[PDB]
Amino acid sequence: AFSRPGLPVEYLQVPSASMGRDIKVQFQGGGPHAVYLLDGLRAQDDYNGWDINTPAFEEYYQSGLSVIMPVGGQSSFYTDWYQPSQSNGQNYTYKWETFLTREMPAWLQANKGVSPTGNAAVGLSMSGGSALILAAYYPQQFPYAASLSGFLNPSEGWWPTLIGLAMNDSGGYNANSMWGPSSDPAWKRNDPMVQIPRLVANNTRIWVYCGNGTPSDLGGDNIPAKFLEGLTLRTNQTFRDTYAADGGRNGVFNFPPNGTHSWPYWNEQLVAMKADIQHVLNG
Numbered sequence: 716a717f718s719r720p721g722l723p724v725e726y727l728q729v730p731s732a733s734m735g736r737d738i739k740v741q742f743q744g745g746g747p748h749a750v751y752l753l754d755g756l757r758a759q760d761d762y763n764g765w766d767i768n769t770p771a772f773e774e775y776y777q778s779g780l781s782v783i784m785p786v787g788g789q790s791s792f793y794t795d796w797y798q799p800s801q802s803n804g805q806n807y808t809y810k811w812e813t814f815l816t817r818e819m820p821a822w823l824q825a826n827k828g829v830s831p832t833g834n835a836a837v838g839l840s841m842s843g844g845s846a847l848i849l850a851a852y853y854p855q856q857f858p859y860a861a862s863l864s865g866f867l868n869p870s871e872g873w874w875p876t877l878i879g880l881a882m883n884d885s886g887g888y889n890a891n892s893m894w895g896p897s898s899d900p901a902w903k904r905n906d907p908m909v910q911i912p913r914l915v916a917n918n919t920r921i922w923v924y925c926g927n928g929t930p931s932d933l934g935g936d937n938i939p940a941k942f943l944e945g946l947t948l949r950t951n952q953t954f955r956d957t958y959a960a961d962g963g964r965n966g967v968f969n970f971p972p973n974g975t976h977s978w979p980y981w982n983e984q985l986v987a988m989k990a991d992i993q994h995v996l997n998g
Contacts, residue, residue, distance in 0.1 A: 716766045718773050719745040724766075725995045733810035739786035740819065743772050748782035748996045751815065751857075752848075752985075753842035757886045758789045760965045765985075768978035779924075781829050781998050785819065790881075790888035793838070793845040793958055794905055797895060802885035805968040816853050835859035835992050839981045840931050844869060845920065849916065854917035859995050861922035862907070863984050864931060864976040869952040870902035870909065873946055884935035889963040897939050908954050911961050920995045921958075925951040926976035926985045967991065 718724065723744065728737045752771060763784035765771045773820045775782050788811050796809040820831035836857045838846035843865015850860035859955055869878055875897035888980040896903035903909045914921060929940045930947050955968050969987075974980045 716768070716770055716772065718770070720928070722773060722776055724772050729819055731814050731818050733813040735807055735819065738814060738819070738962070740828070741766055741772075741784040741786060742823075742827075743782040745775070745777060745781050746779045746997070747781070747828060748779075749783050749829050749876070750775065750776060750835045750837055750889060750953075750992060751783060751846075752784045752843055753790065753793055753838040754785070755840040755842065756790055756881060757840075758787060758791070760787045760926075762786060765979070766773060768821070768951075771886045771982065771984040771985055774982075775989065778989060779993060780835075781827070783819075784822070785815070790841070790903070791835075791885045792848070793842055794892065794895045797894075798892045800892045802889055806887075809893070812849070815849065815862055815955055817855060820856065833858060833996055835861065835996060837861040837863070837985065837988075838865060839863040839867065840902065842865070844907045846990065847919075848910060849904050850917065850921070851907070851910040851913040856920060857919070858917075859920045859922075859992055860914075861924070861984070862896045863924040863981045864926045865923075866908070867923075868906060868908040868950045870897065870906040871950070874950070877933060877938075877943075877946075880936045881932055881959050885932065907980040908950075908957060911954075911958050911963065914958070915961050915963045918924070918965050920991075922988050922991065923951075923955070923966060923968050924974070924981075925955075925968070926974045926980060927970075927972060929965050931976040944950075 727740045777888035795812040799805040814969040823829035843862030846860045850857040882888040985994045
């Protein structure tokens with residue numbers, strides 16, 4: 716990520732009892748509250764996409780916030796799966812919600828002094844919705860959530876099909892093993908649109924970036940770009956309108972015409988929200 720010399724980035728091995736393996740975590744300490752930077756659909760096992768593609772660590776150096784980049788979890792949606800992914804030979808069950816909400820914060824509190832409460836969850840593409848869902852169900856841990864080009868209504872219309880095809884294109888993962896058939900309650904449970912009343916009741920500070928142009932990680936679905944763009948626009952508009960109609964009053968919604976679904980503009984948003992996170996989490 717082309718950091719300037721002299722920056723204290725660490726790589727940690729954090730045991731996950733629920734997944735029966737160690738999870739690598741890239742870490743920069745800087746204060747008791749942290750920004751959890753979640754990865755996209757094609758998350759690798761060596762480095763988090765934020766560190767591969769952006770200067771996130773340097774941008775948040777001496778911000779008064781710690782930065783946590785978990786590594787791994789391709790196509791996981793940072794959720795707890797029903798079962799090991801059926802077809803690609805996965806030999807354990809993804810339990811990334813358990814890891815992010817229980818196992819990892821316990822480790823970081825005991826060893827780093829990072830507070831398990833009062834943090835920000837920031838996700839993009841696959842994990843944009845994850846960040847909102849984490850805030851919806853764990854508001855003490857995440858009073859702040861940002862979704863950058865997230866799937867804001869994964870249980871509706873075209874989205875279960877498109878997500879299923881995207882997960883197969885990203886490591887051959889099976890959405891059915893994750894949340895069941897699209898009729899299963901897990902799809903609505905993990906749908907940010909459906910959980911808007913929780914975000915409102917929690918008074919979650921939400922930062923929602925809506926990009927333009929060709930969506931990301933949908934490259935293998937054999938569908939015209941403009942159709943995907945139309946679906947995305949409609950779903951994003953519905954999310955914003957529903958948040959307002961349901962009494963939401965703690966949101967930032969960003970829809971710049973030249974914004975794209977890409978690391979450069981996801982970084983642009985991460986930088987733009989820094990003062991916002993600082994004021995909300997640290998006064």
